[PDB]
From TrEMBL:
Residues that coordinate or bind (2R,3E)-phycocyanobilin: 187, 193, 243, 245, 261
Domain Phytochrome chromophore attachment site: 123-281
PROSITE patterns assigned to the protein according to its UniProt record, in alphabetical order: PHYTOCHROME_2
Protein name: Near-infrared fluorescent protein
């Protein structure tokens, strides 16, 4: 155990900013070796401006999450990074700057438009239909659904927008087991979950033992964390190899999910995930007034 999905890098720093852990794909994306970085200082590995951004963000020890940091190394180029504090470690997760031609970009206009359209929705039903259609425009996903939770944590697909070629899931009910209590808990903490490719080979993080708590590294807060085989099989059975879900939060309660599926592996960068997050906040607020 102790692995992530390969579409990014995970570096784990101790509270003092010393590199204590890393995903095995660091030489393949940066050039530097994993062992040639464990025990190394962040001041040596990152450029002066990057180390400054990191130090400034980590100067408040209460702050659990950080806005995207441009991460540049001394041997560089720039990665888009997210940090989280969990299990007494600072997790720095990097998305490579290498954009694919199939992947969407330029989310601003489409997001402003989505929010303009969403505000004009008259009912809870028509706001969820507009949110599904608008998220599909922003992202390019094949199918986008609004999956609402019932009191027993079972859900129903109350809304959906999709490519004509893909099948419908509108009106379908599923047990609470499909999205279990511990998956649901992490969605109240980190609002967007991504699985760009259900057939990924997990990339391990070495060492997989936390050098402070004694206990192995808890990656339950990492964006790149591995997926339970049960969910991967569930997705494979419906023919969707790329997924993304955005929680609809009513306070800390999970009202539902904005579920996105793609037939082939599909990736939405940090910019588009933050754009979708905003749409979900607008939608949750409107659900609150309309309820
Ligand atoms: C395993 C035996 C049981 C199980 C576990 C499981 N599910 C998830 C995560 C998700 N499950 C879904 C559920 C749906 N997706 C949909 O498209 C539909 C309607 C067609 C449903 C009911 C969702 C949206 C997620 C979130 C992840 C994602 O965006 O795809 C987990 C957590 C996996 C993770 O790492 O996030 C687990 C452990 N699923 C089953 O079916 C079994 C009963």
């Amino acid at each position: 155990p102790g692995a992530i999905q390969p579409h990014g890098l995970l570096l784990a720093l101790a509270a003092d900013m010393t590199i204590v852990a890393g995903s095995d794909n660091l030489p393949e994306l940066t050039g530097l070796a994993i062992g040639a970085l464990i025990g190394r200082s962040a001041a040596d590995v990152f450029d002066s401006e990057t180390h400054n951004r990191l130090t400034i963000a980590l100067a408040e020890p209460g702050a659990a999450v950080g806005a995207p940091i441009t991460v540049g190394f001394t041997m560089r180029a720039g990665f888009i990074g997210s940090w989280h504090r969990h299990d007494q470690l600072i997790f720095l997760e990097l998305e490579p700057p290498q954009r694919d031609v199939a992947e969407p970009q330029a989310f601003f206009r489409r997001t402003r438009s989505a929010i303009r359209r969403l505000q004009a929705a008259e009912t809870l039903e028509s706001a969820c239909a507009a949110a599904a259609q608008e998220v599909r425009k922003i992202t390019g996903f094949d199918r986008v659904m609004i999956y609402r939770f019932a009191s027993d944590f079972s859900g129903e697909v109350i809304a959906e927008d999709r490519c004509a070629e893909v099948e419908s899931k509108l009106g379908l009910h599923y047990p609470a087991s499909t999205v279990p209590a511990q998956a649901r808990r992490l969605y109240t903490i980190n609002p967007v979950r991504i699985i760009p490719d259900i057939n990924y080979r997990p990339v391990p993080v070495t060492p997989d033992l936390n050098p402070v708590t004694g206990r192995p590294i808890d990656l339950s807060f990492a964006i790149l964390r591995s997926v339970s085989p049960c969910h991967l099989e569930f997705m494979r059975n419906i023919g969707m190899h790329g997924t993304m879900s955005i929680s609809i939060l009513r306070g800390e309660r999970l009202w539902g999910l904005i579920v996105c599926h793609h037939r082939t592996p599909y990736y939405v960068d940090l910019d588009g995930r933050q754009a979708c997050e905003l749409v979900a906040q607008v939608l949750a607020w409107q659900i609150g007034v309309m309820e």
